[PDB]
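Case 86 in the screening queue. Each case pairs one protein sequence with one candidate compound; here the compound is 4'-phosphopantetheine. For every case the pipeline is the same: read the inputs, emit a complex structure as tokens, and attach any notable structural observations.

Predict complex for case 86.
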Amino acid sequence: GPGSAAADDGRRAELADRVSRTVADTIGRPAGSIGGHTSLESMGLDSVMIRALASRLSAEVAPVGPEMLFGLRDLDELVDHLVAAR
Ligand SMILES: *P(=O)(O)OCC(C)(C)[C@@H](O)C(=O)NCCC(=O)NCCS
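Case 86 output:
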């Protein structure tokens, strides 16, 4: 039927769970605390954590450089890049 919240919104959710676990392992928090709308400032993602997270996302989700991660608002903007890279 009609798209909700968008067309192919479920294809982001398949990648966003892998992103959330990959972020959780980088910052040392429980995986249940992470979610798509969470700001990267609220997760403490400084330059060193971003350089680690880029390598971790390349190993566990899809290839990405830290130059993309410095441009992000939240994990919803990131998963739109990685779902399109596959
Ligand atoms: P990245 O190498 O671009 O930056 C790393 C950083 C630790 C400097 C950055 O993430 C940051 O927190 N910048 C703000 C620093 C600040 O407002 N005051 C100095 C705190 S020691």
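Case 86 observations:
- The domain at 9-85 is CATH 1.10.1200.10 (Non-ribosomal Peptide Synthetase Peptidyl Carrier Protein; Chain A).
- The radius of gyration is 12 Å.
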